[PDB]
């Protein structure tokens, strides 16, 4: 399935997302960015049902951007994640629920701390040092249970991530075509363009 | 002609002229009615005037059978009268269906007064130009008279009278209850309570009545019914043998 991992180090939150889009027996694309920037310091990654996935993300993006312009101010990671949870929680009892799981990574400027939020399509939210959706969690949680330290650098976090992707490339039955990696810290959001053979 | 004369909004005096004008409509028919309580019955008398000789006399009536137990006499124009009758019937039938017992007289009255109150408060509805007199022998309260007016006001009476010559009859009755000291006619058979009512109508209005001049409703335990000319004819003969 779709790979969506995230890890919170001391000064940033790293998100990594599989690049494959697969329908039936064909890999249609291998450079897919499973991410939308919500605000300058908040990133969302998503996985689940084919259409709902992007549709939900862009919907959240429209709303958060609307807030920023109306208030000339950027919502905290914590506030954005509650807004997201409630949307999914309303969705689970509607006629056709959004089947989308998300990770929210943000740098809170008021507190000067990175924050990671894991939210499933039911609207279950939890703040975590590291998280994952789908089967990929079955490998990475225990890996990180061993390897992760709270005081790691952004560079150390990328190494830990390099370990997680290696494991999944070794053990997962599906070819997810690598990941796109994104860092969220005090200077905003940036893409590590070299990961496939770095 | 300001707006305070045309719809039910307050005037600077705190009055509601449309309500006041609706009271005037009640006498428009020039009919007098009176109602008395017996020991185990309630009787309503109303004048019956048939000016046109083209009219079928049987269809001219201001007394209505609301339910098995409840009768209503109306003072006011027939169309508004029939509007209230129909509604009362529907309310009576509905009460029984929803609550499993017959709607009491006083409760139907309170409800019809509440409807009237609404027309008193909402702009797009006019009040009805009628006064409603409800009678029965309530299973819990005994014989009952309850009367509602265009103001949404209602109350229970020992006896009551309504129409242009309301006052003549009221004082006549007030004088009777002054003497007797009790709050009803001490009499068993309804036939004699009907006779009493006719008598005190005659003395108050200073008029004799033939069988076609009157309309009578009787409410006893578990039935309200009206009298035909012949039951009235029989009642007029009875009063004639002494008075």
């Amino acid at each position: 399935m779709d790979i969506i991992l995230g890890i919170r180090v001391q000064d940033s939150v790293i998100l990594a997302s599989s690049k494959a889009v697969t329908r039936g027996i064909s890999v249609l694309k291998d450079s897919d960015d499973k991410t939308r920037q919500l605000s300058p310091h908040t990133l969302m990654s998503f996985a689940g049902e084919a259409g709902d996935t992007v549709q939900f993300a862009e919907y959240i993006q429209a709303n958060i951007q609307l807030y920023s312009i109306r208030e000339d101010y950027e919502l905290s990671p914590q506030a954005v994640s509650s807004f997201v949870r409630q949307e999914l929680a309303k969705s689970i009892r509607s006629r056709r629920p959004y089947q989308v799981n998300v990770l929210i990574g943000g740098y809170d400027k008021k507190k000067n701390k990175p924050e990671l939020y894991q939210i499933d399509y039911l609207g279950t939210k939890v703040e975590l040092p590291y998280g994952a959706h789908g089967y990929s969690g079955f490998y990475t949680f225990s890996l990180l249970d061993h390897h992760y330290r709270p005081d790691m650098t952004t560079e150390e976090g990328l190494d830990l991530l390099k370990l997680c992707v290696q494991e999944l490339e070794k053990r997962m039955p599906m070819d997810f075509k690598g990941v796109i990696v994104k860092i969220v810290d005090k200077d905003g959001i940036r893409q590590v363009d070299d990961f496939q053979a770095q | 002609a300001g707006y305070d004369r045309h719809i039910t909004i307050f005037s600077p005096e705190g009055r509601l002229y449309q309500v006041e004008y609706a009271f005037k409509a009640t006498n428009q028919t020039n009919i007098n009615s009176l109602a008395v309580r017996g020991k185990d019955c309630t009787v309503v008398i109303s004048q019956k005037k048939v000016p046109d000789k083209l009219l079928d006399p049987t269809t001219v009536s201001y007394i209505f059978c609301i339910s098995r137990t409840i009768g209503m006499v109306v003072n006011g124009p027939i169309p508004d009268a029939r509007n209230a009758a129909l509604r009362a019937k529907a309310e009576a039938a509905e009460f029984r269906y929803k609550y499993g017992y017959d709607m009491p007289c006083d409760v139907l009255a309170k409800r019809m007064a509440n409807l009237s109150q609404i027309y008193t408060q909402r702009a797009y509805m006019r009040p009805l130009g009628v006064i409603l007199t409800f009678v029965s022998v309530d299973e819990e309260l005994g014989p009952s008279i309850y009367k509602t007016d265009p103001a949404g006001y209602y109350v229970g009476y020992k006896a009551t009278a309504t129409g242009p010559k309301q006052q003549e009859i009221t004082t006549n009755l007030e004088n009777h209850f002054k003497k007797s000291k009790i709050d009803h006619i001490n009499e068993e058979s309804w036939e004699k309570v009907v006779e009493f009512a006719i008598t005190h109508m005659i003395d108050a209005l200073g008029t004799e009545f033939s069988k076609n001049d009157l309309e009578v409703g009787v409410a006893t335990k578990d039935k309200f019914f009206t009298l035909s000319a012949e039951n009235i004819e029989e009642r007029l003969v009875a009063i004639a043998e002494q008075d």
Partner: protein, 222 residues
């Protein structure tokens, strides 16, 4: 659950056991299954517990308003008519089974209501998983013209049949007596035949037994 209702010469009595269960497990060993609709109209329920309490409170509330509106004591036939019409509307989805009993200005009344909205009248009735045990006691001892004391005995005995023979029922007996003249008397834990025996040992732990990681005082104020 075992609930019964028995008419007597001057009124009506209802009784129930005090056991609620989640499947095989006993949640409350002494709950009250006797409910008030109005002061003199009381109610016992089986089926979906929440449904029977809710339908009792809904109709109880509306009956209060009717009583105020009409200036009259609430009548049992009104409680019945409203319950049955409500239950019917929901075609059985509100799983309330009720024995409703009371005294009103027209006398004393005993009725049963089934979740689909059917009603019946009778002199003695039972509902609940314990109904057959109690019905067999009722069918054995009910006579016409019972005194108050005979009625309480009979109803109480019926609930015991349920307590001893139905795994769904247990613990204690509650009774409510409704006589035509008087105020209704609710008799909570009328019988208590199922007292727990004293345990063999005291399980109170020596202080310190439990290992603690961290600790802090919690603020209630502001």
């Amino acid at each position: 659950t075992t609930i019964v209702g028995v008419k007597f010469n001057n009124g009506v009595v209802i009784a129930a056991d005090t056991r609620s269960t989640q499947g095989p497990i006993v949640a409350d060993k002494n709950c009250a299954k006797l409910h008030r609709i109005s002061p003199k109209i009381w109610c016992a329920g089986a089926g979906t517990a929440a449904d029977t309490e809710a339908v009792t409170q809904l109709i109880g509330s509306n009956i209060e308003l009717h009583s105020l509106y009409t200036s009259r004591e609430p009548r049992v036939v009104s409680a019945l008519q409203m319950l049955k019409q409500h239950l019917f509307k929901y075609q059985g989805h509100i799983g309330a089974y009720l024995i409703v009993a009371g005294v009103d200005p027209t006398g004393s009344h005993l009725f049963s209501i089934h979740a689909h909205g059917s009603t019946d009248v009778g002199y003695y009735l039972s509902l609940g998983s314990g109904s057959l045990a109690a019905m067999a006691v009722l069918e054995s001892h009910w006579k016409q013209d019972l005194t108050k004391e005979e009625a309480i005995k009979l109803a109480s005995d019926a609930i015991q049949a349920g307590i001893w023979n139905d795994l769904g029922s247990g613990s204690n007996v509650d009774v409510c007596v409704m006589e035509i003249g008087k105020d209704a008397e609710y008799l909570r834990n009328y019988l208590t035949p199922n007292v727990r025996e004293e345990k063999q040992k005291s399980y109170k732990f020596p202080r310190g037994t439990t290992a603690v990681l961290k600790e802090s005082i919690v603020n209630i104020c502001d």
